[PDB]
Design a protein around this ligand. Structure first.
Ligand SMILES: *[C@H](C)[C@H]1/C(=C/c2[nH]c(/C=C3N=C(/C=C4\NC(=O)C(CC)=C4C)C(C)=C\3CCC(=O)O)c(CCC(=O)O)c2C)NC(=O)[C@@H]1C
Lengths: 162, 172, 162, 172, 172, 162, 162, 172, 172, 162, 162, 172
C-alpha cells in the first residue's frame, strides 16, 4: 500500500531488520510534506462539487458524442450523467486520499488495479477520464507544494490511463 | 498493513467519504508530534540488544525451569531460537510505533503465534513475561530526560506500552 | 547498500515502477538530514586522532590484560597496539561514511558483513570494540542532529557486535 | 548501485581514506540543488507516457520500415514490446537522475542490451533514435519556465542529457 | 474429468463389463447430434463477453448494494474479480456442453466454491442471480433460428440449462 | 500457435509420446474443415477492397466524431483515414490466415497479443474496431460452413476487444 | 485421460481460454470417427469368447512350455489357464473401451500404467501377451475404418509391451 | 513450430500479403491427400518399437566396436540412452510427417544435436547409420500394399525419406 | 530418528544426566550381538522381492474381492501401488531392525498411514494381513539354520516380530 | 556410486563439513571387510570360465525353449549362445567389482541402471538371468564372509531383475 | 542427527533403497568402535567432578580477569562461578554422549547449533571454553582408541568454537 | 568421484577386464595401512582451524598488500571469504586423503578455480602461498610422534603433500 511509512516498514521487515536512520529519514520526509498534503486535501474537499461538475462538463465538451449516443456506456440519459459524475467523484476522492497518505497507495488499491478490465468490459474510454483529470489540474487553484503534490497524483492517474 | 494515515483512508473508503475536517485535524496533530515518535523509535532501536539480553537474563533467573535440562530454552538451538523471538517481538513493536498503527505487528508477527507456541510446547506465558520485561526497559529508555529537548511524551509512552501489551496478550 | 536514495530506487525498480511522490519524500528526508550529517562527518574527521587514541586507551583501561598477554590477538607489543588503532580507525571511518551517505550501508558492507567470522577466527573480543565505540560516543562532542545521528551509527555498530 | 554520495564513499574506501573537505563541499553543493533535481524527476515522470508515445509515433513516421509487415515493430506482440522498451529506458533514466549517478542505468538496464538486441534482430540504431527523441521532449519539459520558481537548471539539464546519451550509445 | 464416452467406459470398468449394445446405441445417437452440440458451444462462446457484461449490468442495477461503496463489488480490484468469476463460470459451463458431461464443471470450478465465497463474504446468492441471467441469455442465443439449419435443439437446450443450474446451486 | 495440427503435436510432445489415434482424429477434423476454410479465405480475399472500405465507412458512420476530431488517434485527415483502413485491412487479413490455418493462432500471435497496450497507448477505441468487424460479418456474403467458421474468427476478435 | 474431447478441454483449460474453432475441429474428428469406432466395439464384443480362447490357445502354441512348467506364473494347471484367459480378456475389453472413447485413455489408465511392475513382479512374459494381441488382429474380422482403428490399439498395447 | 499451413501464413505475413490463389491451391491439394499422410503416421507409429529395435540390432552387428566394453553403447546406462535416441529421432520424424513441415524436428530435436554428440564422444556417423536403417524399415512399412486402399504414395514417401535424411545429416 | 544408542542419549539429556553404568552395559550387550542383527537385515533384504511377491500372492488368493474388477487392487496402477506399499513397509521394517529402534518406521512410514488408507478407501485390515504374511516369511528366513554359525537369535526374532506387528497395528 | 568411502565423503560434502569420527568409522568398516572382499574377488576370477559355462548351461536346462526358438532374443544359434555367456559374464564381472569396491556401486552403474529397458526392448527374460545368478550362488564355493558378501551382490542382482 | 547408524539409514531412505552391504559395513565399523567408545564414556563419567573443577580452574588461570570483572558474563561471584562449571559440565556430558552414539550428533544437536548466537548475545568468549576443552584433553587420562576418539570430539568442539 | 578402489574398477571396466592379481594386491596393501591413512585424516581435521588461521596470519604478515585498504583481503566480507577459501581447500584435501584419490578435490574444488580467481582479481599466486603454508603445518601435524603407535608414514605423507601441491598448482 505504497506510502512513505508503510514502504519503509516493509523493506525493513523484508530484510528482517530494525528500522535504521534511513527509515527515520523517510519518516522525516513524509512528516515534512504532510503539512502541504493535508492542506491540499481540505482544499480539494471543499471545492468538491464545483470540481466534479466542472470536470464532468469539460468531458462532455471535449467529447460531445457522450451525451447523445444511446446505450449504457454513455451519458445521454440522467442514469449515465450520474455514473459519470460518480466516477469523477471517485477519482477526486482518491486524490485526496493520496494527499493524506503521502503516496499513491490508496489510488493504487481502490481504483487503478483492475481499471483496464472495467473500462474494456463496460466500454468506457480512458480519454474521457484523462480529460476530467486535466480539468481538475487547471481548476483546483492550489499554490506551491500543495499544488505540485496534488498535480503529481492527477498526472499519475493520467499515466495509468494513457 | 496500515500506518496511521492509511488506516484512516481505509475506513473512509468503505464509506465512500472524504476524511472529515475533524479527522484531518487528528492526523495533523499526530504530524506535529512526529519528532517524539521518531525519538521513541530511535531510542528503542539504538538499545535493542541490551533490551533483549537483559530481559532474557531476568526471565531465566526468575524461571530456572526454562533453562534446566529438559526445559524449553535448554540446548543451544532452542536458547538461540528463544532470544531470536524476543528480538523479533521487539522489532515488530518498533515498526508499530513508527507507523503509528498496530497492524504490522498484528498481521506479520502476533497472528497465529499462540497456536505456533502451543504446537511446539513453548510456554507462551513465559514469553509474555519476557515481552513484559522488555516493555519496562523500553519505556524507561524512551522516558529518560538526559540529552533530549524536554517535553511531554506521555501519550506516546501510552501508545508504546499498548503495542507491547498486545504482544504479551497474543502469545500466552 | 542501504541509503535513503538507493533504497528508494531499489524498491521502485523491484516493483517495475517510476518513482512517485513517496520516493520524492524519501529524498526530501535525505537532503534535509544531509546538512547535519555532512557537518558531523567534518567534525569527526578533524577530531580523528584524539578520538582514536582516546578510544584505544579506553579499551586498554577497561581491559588491562590486552596490553600484557603474549600472542597475536592482543596488544602487548607495538604490532598489536597498531592493529588495534587501525581497527578503531576503521570503525570511526565507517561512521563518517554512514553520516555522509545518510545510512548504515557503507558500514554494512565494508565492516559488518563478515565481522563475526573475523573475530571468531582471530580471537578478538567484541567487548573491546564496544568499549571503543562507547568512548567515541562520550567524546565526539557533537550537538543537536549531528549528535543524534552519529550516535545512531555508533550504537548500531554496538548492536552488531553484541 | 551507487547514488551520488555512495559513489564517493566507495572510492574513498578503496583508498582507506575519509572523504576530503573538498569532496564533502562538492556533495554539500549537490545537496543545495536537491530541489531542482527532484523537480526534474517529477517532471519527466509526471509526463512519462506522453514522452514515450510521442517519441514512438515520431520514430515510426520517420522509419516506416519498422512497422511495415516484416519489420521489427510489426505484430502487436512486437509493437507492445517496443513501447515497453522505450518506457523502460526512460524509467531507468529517471532513476539515474534521482540518484545522481549513472549506475542504476548502466547495471540494470544498458548492460548487455546491445547484445540482446543483436540476437533478436532489433535494430539498435533505431532504438537510439527513439531514446534521442525522448531526450529532447524530456529536456524541454524540465526546462519549461511555467509554474516553477525561476532559476538556473542548466548543469542538471546537462547531467540528464548525459544519461539519455549513454542509453542511446549503449544500444546502437 | 469425463466426457460423455469416458463417463460410460469408467462405470463399465468398475463392473468389469463391455459396454452393452443398448449403451453403445445411446452414444451413437449422441454422436448423430454432434453438430448441434458444437453449434451450442460456438454460439455461447462467440457471444461470451456480451453474455457476461449484460448479465453483470442487469445484476448491479437489480442489486445496487453490490456496488455501493462498502459492497462486495465496490473497488476496481473487486469489480474486476467479479466480472472474472462470471466469465469463468461461463467458460466452465461451455466446457461441460462440449464434452457432454458435468465433471469439468463440477471438479475444476464448482467444487469448494461455496466455501470460497463464504470465507470472503461474497454473496453467493447474488452470484447465482448473475449465473441465472447468463443462462437465459445463453439459451436465447442457442435457440435463435437466424442463420442456422432449422431443427430441434430442445434436448440439448435442456442439458445446457442443467449445467447453468448446477453452477447456480453450487455457490449460493 | 494454436491450430489443430500444432496443438496436437504439442501435447503429444509435452507428454513425450508418439501420436496416437486421438491426434489422428484431430487431423481428420482439421483436414475435413479445411475444404470450407480454404474456400472462405479465397472468397474474403477477392472481396478484400469492398469489405475494407465498407467497414471503414461503417465505423465513420457509427462514430462520426472520428472524422472531425483533430489529432493523431483520429481520422479527420487522410493520414488517419489511411491508418484506419490499414488496421481494418490487418483484421481481415488475420481472419483469412485463421481460415487457412484452421485456428486462431495467427491472429493470436500477429494481432491479439499486445493489442490492449497499443490501443491504450495510442488512444484508439476498441468500440471502433468492433464495428468494423460487425460489418465484415454482415457483408462477407459467405454460406454454410465457410460462413459459420469465418464468423467464429470475427466474433473472437470482438471478444478479445470488448 | 487421453481422448479427443478431454484432451481438447484440457489444453484450453490449461491456457485459461474458452474453446475455439480448433477444439471444435477436434470434436468433429472424434464424432466422425465414432461411427466406425462404436461399430467395431459392438463387433468385438460379440466375438469376445471366440477371440479370447483363440488367443489363449495361440499363446499356448507359440510357447508350449507355459502349459507344462510348474509354478504360479504359468498355465499348467486350470488356475493359471484361467488367469491367462482373464488377462487376455482384460486386454480385449480395454480395446473396446478405446474404440468407444476414441483414444488410448482407458487402456493407459486401467492397464498400461504399472504393467511393467506387475509383469516383473509376477514373472509374466510380455512376449506371451504380444502373441495374444497379434492373434486378435489376425482374427477380429473387421473391415475398413473399424479395422484400421482397432488395430492401432492392438498395436499400441504391443508397443507398450515390447 | 509450423505446420504446412502455418508455414505459408508465416511467409505471407512478413510480406503483408494474403496467400495467393496459387498457394491456397497448393495447400488444398495437400488436404486432398490427408488420408495417406495419416496412414503414413499411423503405420510408422504402430511399428515404432520394431522399427527401432531392429535398426539398433542391425547397427550393433554391423559395428561391434559400439558395444564392446569401452565403446559408447557399452554399459546398460549407455545402451538404454542409445535406444532412447533412436526412438526420439523416430518420434520427431513422425511429428514432421504429421504436420507436413520439418520445423518440429529441426527446432526441438536436430538443432545442437551434432554438438551434443561431439561433447559426449557419441559417434554421430553411427547414429546416422541407425537413422538410415530406420528410414528403410519405415518406408517399407508405409509402402506395404496389404490391408489398405490401393493408391500412389510415392510423393509422401519422398517427403518421409526427406525428414529421415536430414536427421541423418544433422548428427554425423 | 533414533538408533538404539541415540534413543538412550535423548532420554539421558532431557534429565541432564550421563548414561548410568547399567544403561552402558545394556548397550554394550546389544553391541556384542551386532553380528546377528546384521545377518537379520541382510537375510530379510537379500530376499525382499520373494517376501513381498509371495505375501501379495497369498493375500489375493485369500481375498479375491481385492483384485476382482471394482476392488482396491484392480487396475495395473493400483496393483502396482499395492505391491509398492508391501515393499515400502518391509523396507522400513528392516531399517528399524538395523538401527535397533522403531522410530524410522514410526515417523517416516506408519504415522498418518491409517488416515491415508481411510481417505483412499484402501482396506487397511487387508494391508495388515499382507504385513502379517511378510512377517512369517521374514522370520522363517532369519531363523533358517543353513549356512550360518549356530546360535540363539530368539531375542532378535522377538524384536523383528515387534516391528512387523506395529506396522500391522498402525494401518488397519 | 554407492561404496562406503564415496558415500561417506558424499554426505560430508553435501552438509559442507569436514569428516568426523562417524565417517572414520565407515572407513574402518570398509577396510575390515576388504580382506574378505578382495579374496572372494580373486577366487571368483579364477573360477570365471567354469562359473560362466556352468551358469549358461543351467539356464538352458531350466529353460530348454531358449535353445530352440528361432529369432534373435534366444540361443538356438551360436550367435545367441555367445550373447548369453557374454551377459552372464557381465553379471559375474560386476559381482567381482562390487566385492572390490565394497558396495553395489559398480553394478548399479554399469549394469543395473537401464537394464529394465534393455530386457523389454530386446525381449530377454529376467527369469533366465535370475537362474544364472542362482547357479553362481550354489557353485562359487566360497566360505565365511567372502560367501556372505558375494551372495549379498548375487541376491541384489536377483532383486533388481525380479 | 549424525551417527553411523542413523546416517546409514538416512542415505538409504533418501535414495529409496533397502540397506546393502555398504550400510552393513557402516554398522560393522560402528559396532567395532563401540567397545572403546562405551568404555571411554564410563571413564569420563567417573572422573566427571575432577575434570570439571580442573577445567574451570584452568580457565580462571588462563584468564584471570574472568574472576574479577563485575557483571553477569563473568565469574567474579558464585552465581557466575556456577554458570561456568555448569557450562563446562555440558561440554563434558555431550562428549560422553558422542562417544556413546559414535558420532558428533548429540553435541551438534544439543550444544553446537546456536552456540554462536548464545556467546555473542551473552558476551561469553569462545576462548574461555577452548581452554576448558584443552584441559579435559590433557587430563582425561584415557589410552588407546578411547583416547583417540574422545579427543576427536573435544577437538571438534574446539573447531566449532574457534 | 572415485576412491582408491573405485578408480581401479573404473579403468578395468573400460577394458572389460577383471582386476588383475597384481592390482588386487596393490589395493590389499592399501587396506593394510588403512589405520595410518585414517589417523592422517583425523589429525589434520582435528586441527583445521589452527592450520587455517595460522597460515592465514603468516600469509598476511608476509604480504601486507593483501590487507592494505584496497587489497583483495580488505573489507570484512573479503577477509571472511578468503579464510573461507583456505578452509575449503583444506577440507577437500582431507576428502582426497580419506578416499585415497584426487578426484573429490579435482572435480569439486580445483577445476575452474583458476578462472574464478582471475575474474574476481584474487591473486591466485597468493592463494598458493597460503595453501603451501597449510601444507607444512598439516604435514608437521601428521608426522608428530607424540601419542601414536610408532611407524612409517612416509609414503602417506608423500601422498598428502601431493594433494596440497595440486591445489597450489590449480590456482596460481
Ligand atoms: C602416521 C600418520 C603416524 C602413525 C600412525 C599409526 N597409527 C597406527 C595404529 C592405529 N591407528 C588407529 C587410528 C584411529 N583409531 C581410532 O579410534 C580413530 C578414530 C576413531 C582413529 C583415526 C588405530 C585404531 C590403530 C590400531 C592400533 C593402535 O592404536 O596403534 C599405526 C600402526 C599401523 C597400523 O596400520 O595400524 C601407525 C604406524 N605412526 C607414526 O609413527 C606416525 C606419526
Amino acid at each position: 500500500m505504497k506510502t512513505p511509512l508503510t514502504d519503509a516498514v516493509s523493506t525493513a521487515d523484508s530484510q528482517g531488520r530494525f528500522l535504521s536512520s534511513t527509515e527515520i529519514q523517510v519518516a522525516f520526509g513524509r512528516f515534512r510534506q504532510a503539512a502541504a498534503g493535508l492542506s491540499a486535501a481540505t482544499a480539494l474537499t471543499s471545492a468538491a462539487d464545483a470540481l466534479i461538475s466542472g470536470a464532468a462538463q469539460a468531458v462532455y465538451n471535449s467529447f460531445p458524442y457522450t451525451t447523445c449516443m444511446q446505450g449504457p456506456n454513455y451519458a445521454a440519459d440522467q442514469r449515465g450523467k450520474d455514473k459519470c459524475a460518480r466516477d469523477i467523484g471517485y477519482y477526486l476522492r482518491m486524490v485526496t486520499y493520496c494527499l493524506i497518505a503521502g503516496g499513491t497507495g490508496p489510488m493504487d488499491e481502490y481504483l487503478i488495479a483492475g481499471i483496464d478490465e472495467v473500462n474494456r468490459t463496460f466500454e468506457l474510454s480512458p480519454s474521457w477520464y484523462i480529460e476530467a483529470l486535466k480539468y481538475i489540474k487547471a481548476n483546483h487553484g492550489l499554490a506551491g507544494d500543495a499544488a505540485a503534490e496534488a498535480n503529481s497524483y492527477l498526472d499519475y492517474a493520467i499515466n495509468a490511463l494513457s | 498493513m496500515f500506518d496511521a494515515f492509511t488506516k484512516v483512508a481505509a475506513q473512509a473508503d468503505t464509506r465512500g467519504e472524504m476524511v472529515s475536517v475533524a479527522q484531518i485535524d487528528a492526523l495533523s496533530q499526530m504530524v506535529a508530534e512526529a519528532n517524539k515518535r521518531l525519538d521513541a523509535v530511535n531510542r528503542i532501536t539504538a538499545n535493542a540488544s541490551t533490551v533483549v539480553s537483559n530481559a532474557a537474563r531476568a526471565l531465566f533467573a526468575e524461571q530456572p525451569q526454562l533453562i534446566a535440562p529438559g526445559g524449553n530454552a535448554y540446548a543451544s538451538d532452542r536458547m538461540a531460537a528463544c532470544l531470536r523471538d524476543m528480538e523479533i517481538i521487539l522489532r515488530y513493536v518498533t515498526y508499530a510505533v513508527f507507523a503509528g498503527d498496530a497492524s504490522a505487528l498484528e498481521d506479520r508477527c502476533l497472528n497465529g503465534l499462540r497456536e505456533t507456541y502451543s504446537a511446539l510446547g513453548t510456554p507462551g506465558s513465559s514469553v509474555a513475561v519476557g515481552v513484559g520485561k522488555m516493555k519496562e526497559a523500553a519505556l524507561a529508555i524512551v522516558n529518560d530526560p538526559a540529552g533530549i529537548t524536554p517535553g511531554d511524551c506521555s501519550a506516546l509512552a501510552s501508545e508504546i506500552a499498548g503495542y507491547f501489551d498486545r504482544a504479551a496478550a497474543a502469545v500466552s
